[PDB]
DNA sequence: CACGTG
DNA sequence: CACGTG
């Protein structure tokens, strides 16, 4: 229940309530949560390393829950 | 654009054929590498500097 | 314009 | 690992 974990949870929750295969950008996420895109991306890539999220390469990249 | 100037001088004040890096310029100038580069790429497009190498890039006055 | 970078 | 980016 740390502040960083709360942030990770906020992002994971946002993406989970997105839908089946729907993805979103770091830009959108940053805007909805009121957090700078840099911090968001730092968390998104980190969570992808942990396997919880999948990055769909592109410009910009799209993010969603893994598998 | 005083910032641009300061960087511009420092660079012309460099040895004949010696090229430097944004990282080095940051330490040698006590300025964030973000602004350094912002200037470096601008001066390069403006033809006042030249960039070579790749990872990272090396900067020296243009001839 | 992708950029997350410690 | 480059990264300059508003």
Curated annotation (Swiss-Prot), chain A:
Residue ranges of region Interaction with Z-DNA? 1-67
Induction info reads: Isoform 1 is induced by interferon alpha. Isoform 5 is constitutively expressed.
Q: How is it modified after translation?
A: Sumoylation reduces RNA-editing activity.
**Domain Z-binding per the UniProt entry, residue ranges:** 1-67
Q: In which tissues is it expressed?
A: Ubiquitously expressed, highest levels were found in brain and lung. Isoform 5 is expressed at higher levels in astrocytomas as compared to normal brain tissue and expression increases strikingly with the severity of the tumor, being higher in the most aggressive tumors.
**What function does this protein fulfil?**
Catalyzes the hydrolytic deamination of adenosine to inosine in double-stranded RNA (dsRNA) referred to as A-to-I RNA editing.
Q: Which disease is it linked to?
A: Dyschromatosis symmetrica hereditaria: An autosomal dominant pigmentary genodermatosis characterized by a mixture of hyperpigmented and hypopigmented macules distributed on the face and the dorsal parts of the hands and feet, that appear in infancy or early childhood. Aicardi-Goutieres syndrome 6: A form of Aicardi-Goutieres syndrome, a genetically heterogeneous disease characterized by cerebral atrophy, leukoencephalopathy, intracranial calcifications, chronic cerebrospinal fluid (CSF) lymphocytosis, increased CSF alpha-interferon, and negative serologic investigations for common prenatal infection. Clinical features as thrombocytopenia, hepatosplenomegaly and elevated hepatic transaminases along with intermittent fever may erroneously suggest an infective process.
Can you quote the domain comment? The third dsRNA-binding domain (DRBM 3) contains an additional N-terminal alpha-helix that is part of a bi-partite nuclear localization signal, together with the sequence immediately C-terminal to DRBM 3. The presence of DRBM 3 is important to bring together the N-terminal and the C-terminal part of the bi-partite nuclear localization signal for import mediated by TNPO1. RNA binding interferes with nuclear import.
User: How the protein assembles, per its UniProt entry?
Assistant: Homodimer. Homodimerization is essential for its catalytic activity. Isoform 5 can form heterodimers with ADARB1/ADAR2. Isoform 1 interacts with ILF2/NF45 and ILF3/NF90. Binding to ILF3/NF90 up-regulates ILF3-mediated gene expression. Isoform 1 and isoform 5 (via DRBM 3 domain) interact with TNPO1. Isoform 5 (via DRBM domains) interacts with XPO5. Isoform 1 and isoform 5 can interact with EIF2AK2/PKR and UPF1.
Q: What protein am I looking at?
A: Double-stranded RNA-specific adenosine deaminase
Source organism of this protein record: Homo sapiens
Which classification does the entry list for the species?
Eukaryota, Metazoa, Chordata, Craniata, Vertebrata
């Amino acid at each position: 229940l740390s502040i960083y974990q709360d942030q990770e949870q906020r992002i994971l929750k946002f993406l989970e309530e997105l839908g089946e295969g729907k993805a979103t950008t770091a830009h959108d996420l940053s805007g909805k949560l009121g957090t700078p895109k840099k911090e968001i991306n730092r968390v998104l890539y980190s969570l992808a390393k942990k396997g919880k999220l999948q990055k769909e390469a592109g410009t910009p990249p799209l993010w969603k829950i893994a598998v």
